[PDB]
Amino acid sequence: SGAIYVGNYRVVNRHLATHNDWANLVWEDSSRDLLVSSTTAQGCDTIARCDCQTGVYYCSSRRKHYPVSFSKPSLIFVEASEYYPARYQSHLMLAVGHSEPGDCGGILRCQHGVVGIVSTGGNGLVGFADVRDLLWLDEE
């Protein structure tokens, strides 16, 4: 579990969104595994607006932050699961790192701010949904 809290927005994995998230919906995209809801209180996270391909992510199944190198956002095949049919997930970045399903929502960051959130895994792989192109998160 986990979210990004920027401005009056809460960014979560779409497959983990709550009823309150759906009832206060700003934007959602199944192809990216992202959902954004509105918040009453202002958040403290800042979004990175950069070209970093190295950063650090939080792994809840280890209670640890790990440094990682990650690929550029791309369209990657994600097999049918208990949350989606077989499809291509867009804006996904892969790295070598430990992950488990409950690790979704952990933040990936660089020196510029938040880059994305854990969305996918694999044997020694972790995938992150990028948020750096969502410029509207910085306003309203």
Ligand X SMILES: NC(=O)[C@H]1CCCN(C(=O)[C@]2(Cc3ccc(F)cc3)CCCCO2)C1
Give the separation between CA 7 and CA 114, rounded to whole angstroms: 13
Strands 34-38 and 87-96: unpaired
Please report whether residue 103 would count as binding ligand X according to CB under 6 A.
yes
Partner in contact with 52, chosen from ligand X, Zn ion, none, beta carbon below 5 to 8 Å by kind: Zn ion
Give the separation between CA 48 and CA 133, rounded to whole angstroms: 9
Please report whether residue 99 would count as binding ligand X according to CB under 6 A.
yes
If phi > 0 it is left, if psi is from -120 to 50 it is alpha, else beta; for residue 128 that is: beta
Of residues 42 and 71, the one with the C-beta less far from ligand X: 71
Write down the least CB distance from residue 26 to Zn ion, Å. Answer: 24
Write down the least CB distance from residue 52 to ligand X, Å. Answer: 20
Residue from the set 83, 90, 110, 112 that interacts with ligand X by CB under 6 A: 83
Which residues, 22 to 81, sit near ligand X by CB under 6 A? Answer: 33, 78, 81
Please report whether residue 126 would count as binding ligand X according to CB under 6 A.
yes
Instruction: Sheet with 107-110: list strands edge to edge.
Output: 64-69, 54-59, 107-110, 113-120, 125-130, 87-96, 74-78
Question: In this structure, are residues 122 and 109 in contact, taking their beta carbons and an 8 Å threshold?
Answer: no
Of residues 71 and 81, the one with the C-beta less far from ligand X: 81
Contacts with Zn ion, residue ranges (CB under 5 A): 48, 50, 52, 110, 112
